[PDB]
Amino acid sequence: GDFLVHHAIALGLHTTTLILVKGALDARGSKLMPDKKDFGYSFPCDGPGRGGTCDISAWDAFYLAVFWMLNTIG
Amino acid sequence: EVKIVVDRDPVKTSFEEWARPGHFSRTLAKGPDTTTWIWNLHADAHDFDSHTGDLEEISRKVFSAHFGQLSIIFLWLSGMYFHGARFSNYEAWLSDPTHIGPSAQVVWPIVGQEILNGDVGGGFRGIQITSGFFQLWRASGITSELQLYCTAIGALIFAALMLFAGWFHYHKAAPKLAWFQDVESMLNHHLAGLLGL
Amino acid sequence: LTTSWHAQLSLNLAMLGSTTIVVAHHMYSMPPYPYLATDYGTQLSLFTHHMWIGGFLIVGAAAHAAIFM
Amino acid sequence: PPPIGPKRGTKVKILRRESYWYNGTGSVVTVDQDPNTRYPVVVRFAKVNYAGVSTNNYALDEIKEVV
Amino acid sequence: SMRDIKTYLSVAPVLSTLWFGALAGLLIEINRLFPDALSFPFF
Amino acid sequence: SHSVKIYDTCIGCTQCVRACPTDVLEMIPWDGCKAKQIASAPRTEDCVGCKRCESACPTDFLSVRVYLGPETTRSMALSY
Amino acid sequence: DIAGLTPCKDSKAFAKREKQSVKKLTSSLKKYAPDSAPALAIQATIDKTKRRFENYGKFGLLCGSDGLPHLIVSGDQRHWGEFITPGVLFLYIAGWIGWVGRSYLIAVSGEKKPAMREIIIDVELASKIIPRGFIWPVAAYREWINGDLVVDDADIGY
Ligand code: CLA
Ligand code: CLA
Ligand code: CLA
Numbered sequence: 224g225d226f227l228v229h230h231a232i233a234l235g236l237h238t239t240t241l242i243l244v245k246g247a248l249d250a251r252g253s254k255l256m257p258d259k260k261d262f263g264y265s266f267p268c269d270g271p272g273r274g275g276t277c278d279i280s281a282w283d284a285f286y287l288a289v290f291w292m293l294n295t296i297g
Numbered sequence: 298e299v300k301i302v303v304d305r306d307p308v309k310t311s312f313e314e315w316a317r318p319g320h321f322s323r324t325l326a327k328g329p330d331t332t333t334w335i336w337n338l339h340a341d342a343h344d345f346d347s348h349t350g351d352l353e354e355i356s357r358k359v360f361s362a363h364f365g366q367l368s369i370i371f372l373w374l375s376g377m378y379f380h381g382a383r384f385s386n387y388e389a390w391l392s393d394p395t396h397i398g399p400s401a402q403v404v405w406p407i408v409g410q411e412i413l414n415g416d417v418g419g420g421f422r423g424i425q426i427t428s429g430f431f432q433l434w435r436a437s438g439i440t441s442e443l444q445l446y447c448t449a450i451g452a453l454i455f456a457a458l459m460l461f462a463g464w465f466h467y468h469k470a471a472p473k474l475a476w477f478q479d480v481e482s483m484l485n486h487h488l489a490g491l492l493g494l
Numbered sequence: 495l496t497t498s499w500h501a502q503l504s505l506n507l508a509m510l511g512s513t514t515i516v517v518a519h520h521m522y523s524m525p526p527y528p529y530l531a532t533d534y535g536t537q538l539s540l541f542t543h544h545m546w547i548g549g550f551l552i553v554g555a556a557a558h559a560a561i562f563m
Numbered sequence: 564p565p566p567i568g569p570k571r572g573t574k575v576k577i578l579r580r581e582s583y584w585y586n587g588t589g590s591v592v593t594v595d596q597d598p599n600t601r602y603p604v605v606v607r608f609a610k611v612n613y614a615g616v617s618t619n620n621y622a623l624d625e626i627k628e629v630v
Numbered sequence: 631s632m633r634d635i636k637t638y639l640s641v642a643p644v645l646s647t648l649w650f651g652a653l654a655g656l657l658i659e660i661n662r663l664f665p666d667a668l669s670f671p672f673f
Numbered sequence: 674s675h676s677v678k679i680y681d682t683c684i685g686c687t688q689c690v691r692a693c694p695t696d697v698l699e700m701i702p703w704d705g706c707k708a709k710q711i712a713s714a715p716r717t718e719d720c721v722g723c724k725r726c727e728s729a730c731p732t733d734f735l736s737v738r739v740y741l742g743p744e745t746t747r748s749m750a751l752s753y
Numbered sequence: 754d755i756a757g758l759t760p761c762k763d764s765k766a767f768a769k770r771e772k773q774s775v776k777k778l779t780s781s782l783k784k785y786a787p788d789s790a791p792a793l794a795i796q797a798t799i800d801k802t803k804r805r806f807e808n809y810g811k812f813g814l815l816c817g818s819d820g821l822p823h824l825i826v827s828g829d830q831r832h833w834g835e836f837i838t839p840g841v842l843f844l845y846i847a848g849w850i851g852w853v854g855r856s857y858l859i860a861v862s863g864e865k866k867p868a869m870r871e872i873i874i875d876v877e878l879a880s881k882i883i884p885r886g887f888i889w890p891v892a893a894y895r896e897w898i899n900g901d902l903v904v905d906d907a908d909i910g911y
């Protein structure tokens with residue numbers, strides 16, 4: 224049982240790190256939004272064009288990561 | 298006047314369209330550029346109104362699809378009656394309803410799933426049902442498995458009839474727009490012919 | 495009402511959905527089949543099932559009325 | 564006067580950082596000969612971008628000829 | 631036609647259904663022949 | 674009020690001007706493209722920030738850009 | 754033995770669990786006629802249970818204080834049948850599947866509209882490539898040696 228629960232905890236750490244790191248490294252821009260740094264850390268979106276751009280800022284990556292943090296600590 | 302008017306041989310029965318997914322849509326018939334295409338193909342499938350702006354064609358498609366739904370429902374009823382006739386303890390339940398649990402589903406013995414064949418009584422092991430088919434069948438006067446077999450066979454024949462009728466009333470003889478808009482006669486037939494009789 | 499399939503669908507869905515809730519309420523209190531009332535699992539199942547079906551149909555009525563508008 | 568730009572059908576590589584096809588390849592369609600045109604090279608690509616477009620205009624210093 | 635029916639039988643959902651049905655049958659028969667295995671005992 | 678800017682990759686297709694719901698943009702003569710015209714944004718105090726103009730633009734990357742700024746009665750679309 | 758564990762062929766808790774399961778099955782068996790189908794099904798289940806316990810006992814598994822088998826995956830040569838050999842089988846099969854998929858994608862990319870061949874499979878072509886997964890470890894290794902497996906970083910782009 225300890226083996227199984229420890230591998231679950233490892234899953235939590237790796238996924239939370241994925242979310243936060245992707246937020247940090249894509250902050251200045253990506254292929255979908257190559258000029259993101261002009262808009263700042265927190266902004267709502269970039270509109271429904273180009274397929275739709277909900278939750279594209281780095282602030283939103285932090286917002287998503289807090290859920291996984293609560294899951295892991297639980 | 299209220300007259301039965303149709304068009305003969307509207308659509309040719311062919312396998313050409315089955316090999317061209319997205320044929321119904323002028324923007325989907327090109328083929329995929331992204332995965333989104335695939336999802337769109339399933340999302341716009343039964344939206345006849347967006348395929349064309351012609352009311353008569355929409356009505357004909359609606360009629361044929363309703364025939365298809367009736368065929369599927371008949372298949373479902375045939376399955377229920379056959380499983381009641383072949384894999385149930387209905388006959389034993391007829392002699393002790395308060396102490397025996399109804400059951401009409403049994404499982405094969407692999408990977409240990411046969412434990413699901415529980416002790417329901419009457420020398421029978423299986424899964425207990427809650428749909429209430431046993432009470433309905435008892436209220437209809439059914440006392441034998443042969444009668445259930447006959448009902449299942451009849452339902453299979455009716456399902457075949459509904460599917461063929463869908464094919465005929467779409468690809469062979471399709472009613473005109475004036476036929477569908479006779480609401481007075483439709484109300485008369487469905488109030489008196491269907492419900493009353 | 496003679497030129498729009500969506501409006502007809504909206505009205506009919508609303509009526510059928512409400513009727514199903516009526517059926518669920520009436521079948522528990524006046525059990526029509528023999529040996530049904532004392533089969534508690536069947537009674538609970540039938541009531542719950544028809545409640546869910548009626549709710550879904552009523553929601554569909556609003557959807558297709560919006561499509562009409 | 565000599566015609567400017569690569570000839571039609573040439574394969575070119577994209578150097579514009581903010582472009583969808585950055586570091587990819589495309590085919591030259593035509594070149595505008597007006598000296599006032601700022602982005603005269605028309606390039607066509609096999610894959611569409613996020614807006615569903617498959618052609619774009621570029622300047623002479625944003626494309627490299629690949630042999 | 632035979633060409634068209636062979637084309638329709640090659641579409642992705644149909645081929646997936648057939649492939650997974652055959653694989654499921656193979657696995658079920660194997661588990662019926664060598665049941666309740668937790669290890670490889672042959673060598 | 675929001676800020677709207679036009680960059681010199683414009684091909685003068687006029688789609689953004691047709692898409693705007695409060696008449697912010699307009700076309701003016703130019704010599705840098707084959708269409709001999711370019712967009713302009715002289716009335717940004719009436720911009721609501723909807724970004725339909727960005728949805729209409731065909732170039733890659735965009736030639737018209739909208740930066741949301743301080744909010745006013747006109748930019749919040751308040752009728753009361 | 755290893756980690757304070759006990760072989761399952763010498764564990765009292767293991768035998769207790771077997772006896773309890775057999776008794777539970779026999780109690781149900783004693784409700785039906787000897788020649789009825791449910792009785793035969795229960796008897797077959799009992800024989801299967803006894804065979805399972807015997808095979809677990811004589812295949813060299815280890816049992817804990819709870820009386821249940823435990824697996825050893827540290828590399829000890831007395832337990833390779835538990836993880837290492839099935840793992841080799843899993844890797845071989847997975848490599849076959851991946852290799853044939855990659856080869857189909859490479860063979861089909863040369864056409865005018867390759868995407869049309871991804872939603873409609875060319876079975877004639879696929880039936881010539883499927884048997885070649887039989888030697889995927891050799892082909893992949895040789896492809897890696899000659900520099901045909903990987904694309905240079907400079908060439909990657911849409
Ligand atoms: C004899 C066979 C036959 C053939 C060769 C055709 C051929 C054609 N029909 Mg016709 N048709 C037939 C029978 C046939 N039809 C029948 C029996 C009916 C009555 C239901 C109709 C009703 C009908 C309509 C209303 C229309 C056509 C149309 C078409 C065209 C496109 C078909 C297509 O895309 O199919 C490929 C599509 C499918 C295979 C869809 C699946 C259909 C089944 C019945 C659904 C099953 C549901 C499933 C059981 C749900 C559970 C799934 C899972 C969860 C278990 C083509 C000319 C269309 C046309 O001409 O457009 C211009 C059109 O609008 N047909
Ligand atoms: C008294 C005559 C009569 C009867 C019994 C029916 C019966 C039916 N009609 Mg109606 N209909 C009638 C006259 C009649 N209609 C007339 C005169 C018109 C033209 C104004 C229409 C136009 C019409 C349309 C446009 C539609 C229906 C539909 C339906 C079905 C509704 C769903 C239902 O409750 O299924 C209950 C199911 C059963 C009772 C089991 C099926 C029993 C058989 C198949 C009944 C066959 C009835 C039919 C009149 C037989 C004619 C045979 C002859 C032509 C050779 C049902 C089968 C809907 C449907 O689903 O169509 C497929 C539908 O969309 N009808
Ligand atoms: C008689 C009933 C009826 C009919 C004929 C229609 C018909 C239609 N509806 Mg309406 N609708 C109905 C009931 C009905 N509706 C109800 C009850 C609701 C409320 C939930 C709605 C809500 C609704 C919406 C919100 C929309 C429609 C739309 C549509 C159109 C396209 C549907 C389509 O292509 O689906 C294609 C079908 C699928 C892609 C598959 C759906 C599968 C569902 C979501 C899940 C099924 C899960 C299953 C129960 C469990 C499986 C589990 C297992 C696999 C593990 C079509 C005109 C759409 C439209 O554009 O209309 C103009 C649309 O947006 N309908």
Ligand code: CLA
Binds near residue numbers: 408409
């Ligand atoms: C990652 C999750 C996972 C894992 C690792 C396992 C693992 C296992 N499960 Mg479990 N299971 C899982 C998830 C998992 N399960 C889930 C999610 C469910 C619920 C759906 C179940 C439900 C379940 C049940 C109900 C049962 C198992 C059983 C098993 C065992 C099957 C052994 C077997 O069949 O060997 C034999 C199979 C093979 C050897 C596969 C052979 C494959 C092909 C044919 C090989 C061909 C090779 C070819 C000849 C080339 C080589 C030769 C060369 C010269 C070319 C195994 C210990 C069974 C058991 O006995 O457990 C103790 C069992 O009864 N599982």
Ligand code: CLA
Binds near residue numbers: 874879
């Ligand atoms: C040809 C098939 C193929 C191959 C060789 C690879 C290879 C790879 N994938 Mg990819 N992948 C595939 C299909 C494939 N993928 C598909 C269909 C999907 C959609 C679900 C994905 C989704 C996916 C994700 C999300 C990720 C990868 C990743 C990876 C890498 C590590 C392995 C892994 O995590 O796999 C895991 C992949 C899966 C479990 C998806 C299922 C793969 C199926 C079974 C492949 C075969 C299906 C195909 C239809 C067969 C066609 C046969 C042909 C003869 C017609 C590796 C480069 C990981 C990565 O980036 O690592 C750096 C990663 O994060 N893949």
Ligand SMILES: CCCCCCCCCCCCO[C@H]1O[C@H](CO)[C@@H](O[C@H]2O[C@H](CO)[C@@H](O)[C@H](O)[C@H]2O)[C@H](O)[C@H]1O
Binds near residue numbers: 828829830831
């Ligand atoms: C990345 C870094 C990885 C480091 C991995 C290090 C692994 C070191 C492994 C050393 C193994 C030495 O062997 C160790 O396990 C063997 C079982 O597997 C034991 O062997 C035992 O079982 C054998 C089974 O055939 C018998 O023949 C031996 O008589 C018996 O002693 C050795 O008595 C023990 O000393």
Ligand SMILES: CCCCCCCCCCCCO[C@H]1O[C@H](CO)[C@@H](O[C@H]2O[C@H](CO)[C@@H](O)[C@H](O)[C@H]2O)[C@H](O)[C@H]1O
Binds near residue numbers: 897898905
């Ligand atoms: C226990 C196991 C121990 C194993 C020890 C032996 C390891 C052998 C490693 C061989 C590596 C072969 O591949 C390694 O060299 C290739 C060139 O030869 C490289 O290939 C690269 O250069 C080639 C030209 O030389 C180009 O044609 C390729 O397109 C390019 O990818 C691979 O990108 C690199 O990964």
